[PDB]
């Protein structure tokens, strides 16, 4: 059934599973028309499909051409996502296919279920966690590959860089969700925190800076402070 704080360690067991987030699949810029009406212009989007145990990210880039001539785009985005996730599963060798797919939004359940009818043994699950994966486009290297795409494209990343050499996947996921929650609550401040010190660099093959274990504790503390501050600045506390 639904995934929540009670069964939270299930994410890091040895059953292959994927999170699917579809918030940035259909994105637009808004512009007033010459007549003074409002018009949207679609921009490139992405499906965020993540193995939380290994860090493997299947980033399917959604090029704006897929919306050309189509109606009801938010509803089509749900079925396009499900079509691309099903296509990804079919492309994986049998022993790499997931046993469970957890969707971040309840509106993806029926489209994914219908697209995965051929896979009756793969469970499609909601979650009650409010995961911050929408902020994936605040990661510079991910945003860059999405906006530069001229055609549909899949790009594979490890969203944990090399952290799993030194920490467990439970700890790596907790670090990732802390970073993404901060980028979602105040992107400018979170990015200042991550890059303030110019001696700490991002390897060419990485997404995040090359922090020592000690610097990660400082960083994580600065992110917690940011989130708590904003939550004060927000509710006045």
């Amino acid at each position: 059934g639904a995934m929540n704080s009670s069964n939270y360690a299930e994410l890091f067991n040895n059953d292959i599973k994927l999170f699917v987030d579809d918030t940035n699949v259909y994105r637009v810029t808004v512009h007033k028309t010459f007549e003074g009406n409002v018009a949207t212009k679609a921009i490139n989007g992405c499906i965020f499909t993540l193995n939380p145990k290994t860090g493997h990210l299947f980033l399917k880039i959604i090029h704006t051409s897929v919306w050309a001539g189509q109606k009801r785009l938010s509803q089509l985005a749900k079925w396009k996502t499900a079509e691309e996730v099903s296509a990804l599963v079919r492309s994986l060798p049998k022993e790499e296919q997931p046993k469970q797919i957890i969707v971040t939004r309840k509106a993806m359940l029926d489209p994914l279920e219908v697209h995965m009818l051929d896979f009756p043994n793969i469970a499609i699950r909601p979650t009650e966690l409010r995961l911050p994966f929408s902020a994936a486009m605040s990661i510079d290297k991910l945003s860059d590959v999405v906006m530069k795409a001229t055609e549909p494209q899949m790009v594979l990343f490890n969203i944990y860089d090399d952290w799993l050499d030194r920490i467990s996947s439970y700890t790596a996921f907790s670090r990732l969700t802390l970073l993404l929650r901060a980028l979602k609550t105040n992107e400018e401040s979170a990015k200042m925190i991550l890059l303030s010190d110019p001696t700490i660099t991002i390897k060419s093959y990485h997404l995040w800076p090359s922090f020592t274990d000690e610097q990660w504790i400082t960083i994580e503390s600065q992110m917690r402070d940011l989130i708590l501050t904003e939550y004060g600045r927000k509710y006045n506390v």
Binding site: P111, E113, V114
Partner: protein
Amino acid sequence: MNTVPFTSAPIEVTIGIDQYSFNVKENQPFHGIKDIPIGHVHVIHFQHADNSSMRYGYWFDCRMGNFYIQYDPKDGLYKMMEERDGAKFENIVHNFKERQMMVSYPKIDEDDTWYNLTEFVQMDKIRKIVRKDENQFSYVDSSMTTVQENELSDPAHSLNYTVINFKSREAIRPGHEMEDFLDKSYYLNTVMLQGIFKNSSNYFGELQFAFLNAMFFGNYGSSLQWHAMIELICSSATVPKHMLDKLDEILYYQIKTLPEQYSDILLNERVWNICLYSSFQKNSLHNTEKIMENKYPELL
């Protein structure tokens, strides 16, 4: 006009004949029902005064044989049986009618309620949903489960309604996932009507039979089937115009006949609100929407 005689009434029971109901006292001199409308299927049904558990009854068509009721004290129920000796049967019934031991089926209501509820219902199709091939009549009760219920346990006592499942490979063409899920016309017209039922009359027959089993026996699987068959039509953008007009008439009589105090358990709020106000056919069921809004505005 035909007759279903009773050997006796040894236990106190409410007997219903179609939409009608009457009470028989324990060992009351009762020998059956006469003046039954030839040309319709009929249902004779029972609720014991002692144990309201298990409503049960029999679907029959008097053109197919001479049927009577006899209480069985071992199995504890009123059983339908066929009499093969036609001269014996006639003689028993004439002697019974002469003594006024039988109650009389009403003349015909102005609304033609039974005809309208059973327009498409045929005994031969009932007997394929209810498989007991040695009898010409079909037993149904409140507890019998459907084939679809049994896939999610005694096969001989099941209701073999046509399985309808909107998230199934039968319902969804590979490559038309979004199309077929949001517009069920393929599944209605090609799979079910052309493929399985052959025509809309057989579809409506099963829909009407499911409703009547839900209403008369409180059979939950039958209620599920009735609503599924409604929802499949309303959720199709492309439906023959004659079918929509006939569906509106079918449902109007069903809603008109449903006891007001059974609406909570026999009507599915989600299906009816979707069908009347959100579906492709939201504007095609004028008579049904009007009686629903006057009789059950609460559900909506």
